Nucleic acid binder design. Structure first.
Lengths: 133, 190, 24, 158
RNA sequence: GGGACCGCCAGUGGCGAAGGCGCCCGGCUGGAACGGGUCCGACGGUGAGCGCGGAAGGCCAGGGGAGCGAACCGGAUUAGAUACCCGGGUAGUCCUGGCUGUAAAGGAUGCGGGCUAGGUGUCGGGCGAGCUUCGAGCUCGCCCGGUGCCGUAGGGAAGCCGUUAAGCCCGCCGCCUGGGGAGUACGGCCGCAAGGCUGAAACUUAAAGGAAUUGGCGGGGGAGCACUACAAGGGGUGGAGCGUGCGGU
């Protein structure tokens, strides 16, 4: 690690928001180095706390502390969602992670839509009425 | 983590004759020569000008790295979903012009351009408009050098001009260069 | 209901054609 | 008007000229206008296209209202004049054009296959021609011994 | 690298006889509104039969197969699941050649014409303008056709319908005459099969059906109060013995 002349590293904080868990992973600008990867499960094991927003807040906060050591001080936030036969809407940890970043002191200059939306179409599981209980 | 980080080597983006150079953007890697094909997104912090403001995101791909300084060429432009969905509207038309450009500098360029119709009337004048959009973009591109053309194409100068000559046939609104993808780069390395 | 009547008829016919086919 | 036979909409609201008093805003005679019709027929124009010409150029309202009668055949206008000269065949121009289209269609369906829309149109044009012909043969516009089948059609066209 | 499809565009919108038809570009090709009736001169309307098209899936061959997913194999739910739910997964979905023919294939409104108050929007054409970015770009009216909303005379059991008639007339075709048995049986006919077309009787019944009115009801929607409601809070019964009443004995 020499040949820094940017004078302020920037990291594209990736947020994958499933209804089944929330994962928060941060990489530098390139994407070529992962500093942090923290998931809801690693925070707390209980299968319902896994997508829960409090669990997601703390996972994002942990990563955020690591990012500050690095001198990652600005973040782009890239929101996506599951998409191949799931709902394409982002889960609860999106809103939680944005809040953990806002408290954490990492300033957001862009908000980015890299979510799976096809222009070629994908069918999600149902039963001819969608999902039901 | 995994490293010191000192096993990881960091390299720094410079793009002579593309923007004249930059000093923003860093690429870490493990081992030398795993950064030769990596694509780096910068908004640009060397300018707060129109490239940053209204043409938000530019992608540059480090083609080669020499002596731990990274020589970089234009990989792409794009907008985002926020712009495309905002500007489009109902009871109108969306018009898009694809052309595959050959420039005389040894670069091949693909432009998608985004033109938005002035309200009512779906007419063959639309498709007529597409003929014109390809022809104009080609003439500007053909004359100039690739460094010159990229600066005009990403900037509003090209959009603003397409709208003036089209406007005469059939009025337009809200013309933009949705994306530019460098169909083929190399002309000085294989 | 509606499904019932038709499939019953199709069963009624296939048994009858079975009993026609193997006792001629 | 209005009738339906290959459309789900009505017919056009156009009507014949009612300047049923003879021209006097024209400044050409009957004689000059006949002269023009011989030259135009000979040139390669078909009898509908001549009459359109006459209305624009020579300024008549209708060609039914400057030249009826002058020969003793029904509905005296252009092709009756020509018919006595032998510049028009007996098979009405109407029928000549219908028949020409009916040939054109077999040749496309061949080369372009899987045409549903175009195939239904070939049935429909042909069908109409048999019904028109059935009346014409009787009227003497066509011979009695004539028949309309699609091979005879191709013959006429070629 | 590969298959498949085209979010935005997309609109109460446009096209086609109908089934139906949506990436973008070019060629080839069918139909339509319209203005100008230029042309034949009653050639017209309807139409039993006949003929033809016919979504999806299916059947047959070949190819293609990324995702999706009858069958299927687990898991949960549930008393058990036979089901909703989840993990895998085959035909199939895709393409071409071939074959069969069904639909709540609906506007549940047969086809052709004349005629019977209007108003507004909208699509495309004709026409006269205003605005103009000088392009029908934005708009208005007359006029012609089409799709929508509101509504007259009238009609309808009523709901509604009302120039797009379920209005007033005429010509022709198709069809019905209580419910179940039964769209079965039997025969013939078509289909490769699945099926399709035609199509009974014995027997049994005092109802079957349509619209609206009112009421109850709804793990249907919206809103609001209650201390004989719930929460908070305090005591108590169910334990034991006794007193008292009842069932049983």
């Amino acid at each position: 690690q020499v040949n820094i002349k940017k004078k302020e590293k920037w990291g594209i904080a990736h947020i994958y928001s499933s209804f089944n868990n929330t994962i928060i992973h941060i990489t530098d600008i390139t994407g070529a180095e992962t500093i942090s990867r923290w998931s809801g499960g690693m925070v707390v094991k209980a299968d319902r706390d896994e997508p829960s927003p409090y669990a997601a807040m703390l996972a994002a906060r942990r990563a955020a502390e690591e990012a500050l050591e690095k001198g990652i001080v600005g973040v782009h936030i890239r929101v996506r969602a599951p998409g191949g036969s799931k709902s394409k809407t982002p889960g609860p940890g999106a809103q939680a992670a944005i809040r953990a970043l806002a408290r954490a002191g990492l300033k957001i200059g862009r908000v980015e839509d890299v979510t799976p939306i096809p222009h070629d179409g994908t069918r999600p599981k149902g039963g001819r009425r969608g999902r039901r209980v | 983590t995994r490293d010191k980080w000192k096993l990881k080597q960091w390299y720094i983006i410079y793009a002579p004759d593309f923007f004249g150079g930059v000093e923003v953007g860093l690429t870490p890697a493990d081992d030398p020569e795993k950064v030769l094909n990596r694509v780096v997104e910068v908004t640009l912090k060397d300018v707060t000008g129109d490239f940053t403001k209204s043409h938000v995101k530019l992608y540059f791909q480090v083609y080669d790295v020499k002596g731990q300084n990274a020589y970089t060429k234009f990989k792409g432009m794009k907008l985002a979903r926020s712009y495309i969905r905002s500007l489009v509207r109902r009871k109108t038309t969306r018009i898009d012009g694809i052309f595959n450009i050959t420039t005389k500098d040894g670069y091949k360029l693909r432009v998608m351009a985004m033109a938005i119709a002035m309200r009512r009337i779906q007419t063959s004048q639309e498709r007529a408009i597409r003929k014109i959009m390809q022809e104009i973009i080609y003439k500007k591109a053909e004359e100039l050098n690739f460094k010159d053309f990229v600066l005009e194409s990403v900037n509003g100068k090209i959009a603003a001009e397409i709208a003036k000559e089209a406007k005469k046939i059939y009025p337009l609104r809200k013309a933009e260069i949705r994306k530019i993808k460098v169909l083929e780069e190399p002309q000085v390395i294989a | 209901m509606r499904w019932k009547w038709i499939k019953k008829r199709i069963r009624r016919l296939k048994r009858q054609r079975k009993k026609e086919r193997g006792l001629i | 008007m209005a009738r339906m036979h290959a459309r789900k909409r009505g017919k056009s609201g156009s009507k014949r000229p009612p300047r049923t008093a003879p021209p006097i805003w024209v400044e050409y005679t009957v004689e000059e206008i006949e002269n023009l019709v011989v030259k135009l027929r000979k040139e390669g124009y078909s009898t509908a296209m001549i009459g359109t010409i006459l209305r624009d150029q020579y300024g008549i309202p209708s060609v039914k209202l400057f030249k009826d009668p002058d020969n003793p055949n029904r509905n005296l206008t252009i092709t009756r004049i020509l018919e006595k000269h032998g510049l028009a065949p007996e098979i009405p121009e109407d029928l000549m054009f219908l028949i020409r289209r009916a040939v054109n269609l077999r040749k496309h369906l061949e080369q372009h296959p899987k045409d549903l829309h175009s195939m239904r149109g070939l049935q429909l044009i042909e069908s109409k021609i048999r019904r028109l012909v059935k009346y014409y043969k009787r009227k003497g516009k066509l011979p009695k011994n004539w028949r309309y089948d699609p091979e005879t059609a191709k013959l006429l066209v070629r």
